[PDB]
Design an enzyme around this catalytic site. Structure first.
Site, PDB file in Angstrom:
ATOM      1  N   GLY A 123       0.635  -1.367   0.052  1.00  0.00           N
ATOM      2  CA  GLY A 123      -0.035   0.032   0.092  1.00  0.00           C
ATOM      3  C   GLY A 123       0.797   1.091   0.018  1.00  0.00           C
ATOM      4  O   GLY A 123       1.881   1.441  -0.777  1.00  0.00           O
ATOM      5  N   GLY A 124       0.426   2.284   0.991  1.00  0.00           N
ATOM      6  CA  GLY A 124       1.114   3.491   1.099  1.00  0.00           C
ATOM      7  C   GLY A 124       2.716   3.031   1.215  1.00  0.00           C
ATOM      8  O   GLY A 124       3.756   3.882   0.946  1.00  0.00           O
ATOM      9  N   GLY A 320      19.738   6.382 -34.379  1.00  0.00           N
ATOM     10  CA  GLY A 320      19.236   7.057 -33.471  1.00  0.00           C
ATOM     11  C   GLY A 320      19.652   6.984 -32.056  1.00  0.00           C
ATOM     12  O   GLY A 320      19.375   7.821 -31.002  1.00  0.00           O
ATOM     13  N   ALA A 321      20.309   5.694 -31.720  1.00  0.00           N
ATOM     14  CA  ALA A 321      21.050   5.750 -30.339  1.00  0.00           C
ATOM     15  C   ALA A 321      22.216   6.360 -30.381  1.00  0.00           C
ATOM     16  O   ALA A 321      22.477   7.165 -29.165  1.00  0.00           O
ATOM     17  CB  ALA A 321      21.316   4.168 -30.329  1.00  0.00           C
TER      18      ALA A 321
END
Lengths: 419, 412
Positions: A123-124, A320-321
């Site tokens: 949870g939290g 692109g790398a």
């Protein structure tokens, strides 16, 4: 055993704990202390009361701890061990937990926030650490978790060291950089075709006597990121790892690299970017899982970055790398290359196949191979990193690898703290 | 037909085109014009020249257009149709393409950036639209980093261009495409409307809000067990005369986000949709919401958050759920929350709760705010008012004007 005061005392410098409030059964205890001399705020959830379940008064002490840390600009360390919210307290408890998150959000990028998770955490106690900067997990309790500790004591150790890395940055030292220089190039395999673990190159650049605190080592393994010290000064390292997925970028590794850049950028930690990457990994899974967007996050992280960030091309940087791996177009501080490095759109053989496609298809079968090779060797001679790259100022200098450590240090030190 | 002047003229108000540079064969034509009066910069890659492949000269026109747009604070629209960087130009073209990215990153959050993809955006060109704020894809358009060619050769998988990177796949599987157009012309129409939403944001008008009030609650099913499409509820709150420009409809559809108008004023809407996965949050719906909150926050667009989820559905969801929390928590634009039927647990906190600083929280009379459902818990709005986490219980017949008033009252 799970006593919050024991745990806080193990974390903090020996004589240093001052409680921020009276002990109670709220399920949290917060204290000020020092971590190797640095005033640090910390809080521990109380594993001894309802499994550490979080309720209104406990959350309030956490929020109070955050207000104090923020006011004094101190790092703040959470020690977890909690099974969820106190259900009997209903919506009041949800609200109080939301208030812990809001404090972490107010702190974000302003003061270092380190979580050390020592017990079952739900949870939290799962989202709270996920709002922090670094998460240390002990065995008793993706890329959510950055560091796995060996045991609970070792988690405090790594947590303590992290405070020092963020808060005791240190200073670049030309003397210490140089005395630690070695021929790092000897760490590459003999063939340019063999994969290898990049981690020894990382630890050979960084100071010999200092741990390299790698983050998320088992998530996105084609990318290695983490913090260490370079001539005494905290730096973040990002390095493609050719051992996994050929060293290619992909959605996960782009996201891992991009979060890590943003983190170092937020806290004024300079970057060393060690590049040997042949491209993004092709694949249906990659396109369909949104690699385009993910890759855009890495472009954006480097392009916005204002801390010094120096690139070292060891072997390849293609396509692109190449652009994404802290290229000059992204406003990189300095870009260094080892003597045999290549900067290109793709490898020469593949490039020739496209550029001279028809002429290759027009040669007879039995001469096609020799021709393809001759063409690729010529294309290498023409460009073949880093010649063309030097000529347009996107590589600044070709360096003797024996001087890698000192050259990197010199470039980071000469850089303004903020571009 | 791929003529960039034709494309730019089809996008811009008639007779408004003012070329930013002499028309050439660089692969790009950039211009200024107006979109319903608003001074707008656009560039169009030139599919008639090397399939629109990006080169030094063409990238430079793009960076120049970005610089003009930044200077003037004009929105900037890119019209795509490009195979990638010009291979023959080597590292020079990679650098020039990186410079385009760097200009989009400079512009990021500062001027609106809208991409209208009309043909390919492949290789280095696919990232261009990804850096912008809203991507509109026309039916013929295709966005991918590596083509089916290289995909099949490297991985053995055999897929066509449409299936790899068509508008259907990017609107559904990846969330890369925000909006899908009916055709080339409709894609310009949608992009023109998006310029309007970002740059003619309007103002709230109490009189117009109240005139459009209807019984929104009548649109919910009789049974509170029953699923139901939230999108009619959203469109009932928003102005009946205006498109609701939904983003990423087919991706993470348990979350609905998009832009519309509320008494004339551009608002962003986030709404759990009980139609899909019970309206639960999960990794990709948390990501969709978080991205959308950050976008509206950057451009001063207020938020309407319509809440009816029962929980969330671990690494991805913990990370993305944190992103959501963080996005709302840092948000500074006015944003109001309406609880229609239920909000539980951690999802309750994430869906613009008072603890994350919502501007105001409204609830319909029968709404439930709880840790979990009653039957789960064993194994109420009055109370949420008492505690302070809901500010006002409203008559659903006044949903639209109450939300408008609370947003209009926030100092901005």
């Amino acid at each position: 055993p799970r006593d919050p005061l024991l745990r806080l005392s193990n974390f903090f410098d020996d004589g240093s704990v001052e409680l921020l409030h009276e002990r109670d059964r709220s399920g949290v205890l917060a204290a000020a202390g020092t971590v190797n001399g640095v005033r640090t705020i910390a809080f521990c959830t109380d594993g001894t009361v309802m499994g550490g379940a979080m309720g209104v008064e406990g959350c309030t002490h956490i929020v109070n701890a955050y207000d104090t840390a923020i006011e004094d600009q101190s790092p703040i360390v959470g020690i977890w061990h909690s099974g969820g919210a106190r259900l009997a307290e209903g919506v009041r408890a949800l609200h109080a937990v939301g208030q812990v998150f809001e404090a972490m959000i107010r702190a974000s990028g302003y003061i270092p926030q380190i979580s050390v998770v020592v017990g079952f955490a739900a949870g939290g106690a799962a989202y709270g650490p996920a709002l922090t900067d670094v998460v240390v997990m002990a065995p008793e309790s993706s890329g959510v978790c950055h560091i796995v500790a060996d045991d609970e004591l070792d988690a405090y150790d790594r947590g303590r060291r992290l405070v020092g890395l963020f808060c005791q940055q240190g200073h670049f030292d030309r003397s210490k950089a140089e005395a630690g220089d070695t021929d790092i190039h000897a760490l590459l395999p003999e063939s340019s075709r063999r994969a290898y673990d990049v981690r020894p190159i990382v630890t050979a650049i960084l100071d010999a006597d200092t741990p390299f605190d790698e983050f998320q080592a088992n998530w996105a393994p084609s990318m290695v990121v983490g913090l260490g010290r370079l001539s005494g000064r905290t730096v973040g390292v990002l390095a493609n790892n050719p051992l996994r997925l050929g060293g290619c970028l992909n959605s996960e590794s782009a996201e891992k690299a991009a979060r890590f850049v943003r983190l170092c950028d937020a806290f004024g930690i300079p970057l060393v970017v060690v590049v040997d990457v042949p491209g993004y990994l092709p694949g249906v899974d990659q396109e369909w899982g949104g690699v385009v967007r993910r890759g855009a996050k890495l472009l954006h992280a480097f392009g916005e970055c204002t801390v010094p960030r120096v690139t070292l091309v060891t072997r390849k940087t293609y396509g692109g790398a190449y652009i994404a791996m802290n290229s000059r177009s992204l406003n990189a501080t300095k870009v260094f290359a080892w003597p045999d490095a290549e900067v290109a759109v793709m490898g020469a053989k593949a490039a020739v196949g496209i550029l001279h496609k028809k002429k290759l298809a027009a040669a007879p079968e039995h001469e096609r191979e020799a021709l393809h090779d001759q063409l690729a060797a010529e294309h290498e001679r023409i460009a073949g990193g880093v010649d063309s790259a030097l000529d347009i100022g996107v590589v600044d200098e070709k360096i003797d690898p024996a001087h890698t450590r000192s050259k990197l240090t010199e470039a980071l030190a000469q850089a303004p703290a903020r571009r």
